[PDB]
Amino acid sequence: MKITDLELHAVGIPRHTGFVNKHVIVKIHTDEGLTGIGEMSDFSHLPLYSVDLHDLKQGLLSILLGQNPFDLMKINKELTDNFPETMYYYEKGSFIRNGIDNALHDLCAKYLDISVSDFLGGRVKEKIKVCYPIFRHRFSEEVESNLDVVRQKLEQGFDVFRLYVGKNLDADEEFLSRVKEEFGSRVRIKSYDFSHLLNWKDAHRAIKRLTKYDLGLEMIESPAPRNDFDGLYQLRLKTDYPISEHVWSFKQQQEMIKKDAIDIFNISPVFIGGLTSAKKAAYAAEVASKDVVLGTTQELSVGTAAMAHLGCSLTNINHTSDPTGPELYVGDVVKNRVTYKDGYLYAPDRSVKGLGIELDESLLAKYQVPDLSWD
């Protein structure tokens, strides 16, 4: 069983709002005709530079050519050697490793004629609760429009949301007030995400005023600057609600563990380098008796399916997760998108081997983009 070729398809799929996120669909071919598919999800994040995919295909091929796809530990070590972790949330190297590792899982699973779920440790549950995002308000005028979004998604089954806050507290508070007023207990906002915008003391004051509204609130996410472990710790001591933070590197996770800086580790394959790395992160959390939730960068169906399988295999996910990326896009590049129902993400049919998702060539072509350049 050996890797014989690699394909990278750049695609740009617009969100209902207009922004066109760029992703790279991965295909790993073997000598036995089995192909693994993966997704280097959402390259549209700072820094404001873009990677040469022609050069990248060459580098990755030199690494993968002739390898046994089942050598996940060996391959991932080499990937990390070439694409180091940098303690940076949006390191493009993480997205890259993610697409490759996830494609390898699909490949191995297909080879064994089993679902990726069975390759990841099996099932603990068949679905995991997720939430839909309401991006941060900048002006009070944006409130009405977001209430429409809430009413619309609730109508579709999403009764839980997560709100990005910190930019305009008066607006944040107006929104929450309007939500409690109209929906009562029909809607829950499980997290207030500050996206690392405020210093911990400023976040403390914000938390104090926003939490006057508790609509099934489960956590406060990223309430301090990136890598501010001490600030997270101090804030955790002053806040009743669990503090959650994204895991973007083992070094960063190690520090938050050692310093008992947070309560919930937000793990997402794309930010940590793939399923192999995400599992290690989740297990590290488990060994430390810490809670976990699956985060998101807003991936398409292929990337979301990866989390569907991983999420349904973990015993330490005790809160609502975030992967609802497909809901923000007008399209995808698969024959059948991931399944959501009543605010839950379902792990693909366990009887279907591999990831349980299939690429649609006509759609790959339709959304194809020449490169990953910015606008």
Minimum CB–partner distance for residue 106 and a second copy (Å) = 23
The verdict on whether 90 is a catalytic residue reads yes
Q: What is the DSSP string of 94-133?
A: HHHHHHHHHHHHHHHHHHHTSBHHHHTT--S-SEEEB-EE
Range 71-100, binding Mg ion (CB under 5 A): none
From the list a second copy, Mg ion, none, partner contacted by residue 265 (C-beta under 5 to 8 A by kind): none
Task: Please identify, using beta-carbon distances, which residue of 227 and 276 lies nearer to a second copy.
Answer: 227
Beta strands 243-246; 35-40: pairing state: unpaired
Check residue 237 for interaction with a second copy (CB under 8 A): no
Q: What is the DSSP string of 150-181?
A: HHHHHHTT--EEEEE-SS-HHHHHHHHHHHHH
36-58 residues labelled b (16+ CB within 10 A) or e (exposed)? bbbbbbbbbeeeeeebebeebee
> 242 vs 207, 292, 312, CA distance in Å?
12, 11, 22
| Residue selected from 20, 34, 51, 363 as contacting a second copy according to rule CB under 8 A | 51
Check residue 240 for interaction with a second copy (CB under 8 A): no
Minimum CB–partner distance for residue 320 and Mg ion (Å) = 12
Check residue 245 for interaction with Mg ion (CB under 5 A): no
Task: Please identify, using beta-carbon distances, which residue of 78 and 358 lies nearer to a second copy.
Answer: 78
Which amino acid would we find at residue 310?
Answer: L
Task: State the burial class of residue 136 (Cβ atoms within 10 Å of its Cβ: 0-12, 13-18, 19+).
Answer: buried
Which listed range, 20-28, 238-246, 301-309, 367-375, lies at the site for a second copy (CB under 8 A)?
367-375
The verdict on whether 340 is a catalytic residue reads no
Check residue 332 for interaction with Mg ion (CB under 5 A): no
DSSP designation for 254: H
Does 15 show up as a binding residue in the annotation?
Answer: yes
Which pair of structure tokens corresponds to residue 21?
Answer: 């996120």
DSSP designation for 35: E
From the list Mg ion, a second copy, none, partner contacted by residue 91 (C-beta under 5 to 8 A by kind): a second copy
Phi-psi map region of 87: left, alpha, beta (phi>0 left; psi -120 to 50 alpha): left
Q: Can you list the pairs that 78-85 forms with residues at least 24 positions away whose Cβ atoms lie under 8 Å?
A: 79/273, 80/273, 83/273, 85/248, 85/249, 85/250, 85/251, 85/273
Check residue 50 for interaction with a second copy (CB under 8 A): yes
208-224 residues labelled b (16+ CB within 10 A) or e (exposed)? eebeebebebbbbbbbb
Residues 309/121, Cβ–Cβ less than 8 Å: no
Range 61-100, binding a second copy (CB under 8 A): 81-84, 86-88, 91-93, 96
**Catalytic residue chosen out of the listed positions 111, 132, 164, 344:** 164
Check residue 227 for interaction with a second copy (CB under 8 A): yes
Which listed range, 46-54, 120-128, 167-175, 328-336, lies at the site for a second copy (CB under 8 A)?
46-54
String marking each residue 251-290 x if it binds a second copy according to CB under 8 A: x---------------------------------------
Check residue 182 for interaction with a second copy (CB under 8 A): no
Does 193 show up as a binding residue in the annotation?
Answer: yes
Check residue 297 for interaction with Mg ion (CB under 5 A): yes
| Residue selected from 47, 66, 113, 145 as contacting a second copy according to rule CB under 8 A | 47
| Residue selected from 59, 122, 157, 216 as contacting a second copy according to rule CB under 8 A | 59
| Residue selected from 55, 113, 141, 181 as contacting a second copy according to rule CB under 8 A | 55
Check residue 221 for interaction with Mg ion (CB under 5 A): yes
Which pair of structure tokens corresponds to residue 228?
Answer: 């501010």
Q: Give residues in contact with a second copy (CB under 8 A).
A: 46-52, 54-56, 58-59, 81-84, 86-88, 91-93, 96, 225-227, 251, 371-374
Which residues are known binding-site members for substrate? 15, 89, 296
Return the active site residues.
Answer: 90, 164
